[PDB]
Amino acid sequence: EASLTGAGATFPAPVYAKWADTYQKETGNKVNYQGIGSSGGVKQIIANTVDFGASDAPLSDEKLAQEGLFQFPTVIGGVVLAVNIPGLKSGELVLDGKTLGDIYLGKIKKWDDEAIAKLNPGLKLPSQNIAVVRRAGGSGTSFVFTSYLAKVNEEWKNNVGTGSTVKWPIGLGGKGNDGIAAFVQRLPGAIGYVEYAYAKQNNLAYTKLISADGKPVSPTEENFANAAKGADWSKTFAQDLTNQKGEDAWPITSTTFILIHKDQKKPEQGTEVLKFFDWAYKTGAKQANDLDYASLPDSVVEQVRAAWKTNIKDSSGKPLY
Ligand SMILES: [Cl-]
């Protein structure tokens, strides 16, 4: 029985913890995962203070080669806009990318702005102030959210850009996906972006969004998967799944990565990290699905397995898988 430690992205923490809990019950192995944020996850793996780092934002091939890291995706999730608008139920409100950007730009301050009214003709929107909430530190969720906004709002693109950290025009800072859920839940009129599981598990109302194709879509596990159907994984694991074309493609979709060293100095730990993730691909789909994360296609996991065999070695060049 092994004792493993990972750290990073809170985006997939609900499913990683669930997998960790089950894995221990079935095998005795203990995986301790700390949701500290993608930025921290990256610093820890590079500082070798954990067996595996987790980040929603992918490292480039050059950056991976420079740090001697290997990156592989695990699941597909989606970012949603959780809202606390009194008198509205979950899924009722529809926003489009331009309008979401303008709210984040501080250009739209009330819930009954003409712009929101236009997207929701049948709606009785309150003249409530919009309380924008965003991440306090380095966040992979911020990375995918800002990647999406830059694509749909030119002013955001030109003035704030994309990143795990950006100079937010307005908004209160929340710590972690959990912190944003808690803020929205306590601030009437709040809008915050969270990985879907955090909204559902906290009973937060969320909005629908309009697809790249121009259609209103609801955030569901299937719609997260739809957004990835067109990804050429054979080309690279570092797929941009934001604003993807296709029917029922949730527009703010993203996979998330695990980072491990290619040259394993503690090969026993490395072998065990691999087994845990292999077990998760082999047996963790239902648990990911229960939490509304979509599984990667089998073809991708096979690609990942082949890359493990080729890339992960001990200091004697012996593969660990
Ligand atoms: Cl944060």
UniProtKB/Swiss-Prot annotation:
Q: List the disulfide bonds.
A: none
Q: What is its main location?
A: periplasm
Which keywords annotate this record?
Periplasm, Phosphate transport, Signal, Stress response, Transport
Q: Which GO terms describe its biological process?
A: DNA damage response; phosphate ion transmembrane transport; phosphate ion transport; response to radiation
Q: Name one GO molecular function term.
A: phosphate ion binding
UniProt binding sites for phosphate? 9-11, 38, 56, 139-141
Tell where it localizes: Periplasm
CDD domains from the xrefs? PBP2_phosphate_binding (cd01006)
Which terms in the GO cellular component ontology are assigned? ATP-binding cassette (ABC) transporter complex, substrate-binding subunit-containing; membrane; outer membrane-bounded periplasmic space
Upregulation:
By phosphate deprivation. Positively regulated by PhoB and negatively regulated by PhoR.
- List membrane-spanning regions: none
Extract the Pfam families matched here: PBP_like_2
* Its biological purpose: Part of the ABC transporter complex PstSACB involved in phosphate import.
User: Could you describe the subunit structure of this protein?
Assistant: The complex is composed of two ATP-binding proteins (PstB), two transmembrane proteins (PstC and PstA) and a solute-binding protein (PstS).
Q: Which PANTHER family match?
A: PHOSPHATE-BINDING PROTEIN PSTS
Q: Which family does it belong to?
A: Belongs to the PstS family.
Q: What is this protein called?
A: Phosphate-binding protein PstS
What organism is listed for this UniProt entry? Escherichia coli (strain K12)
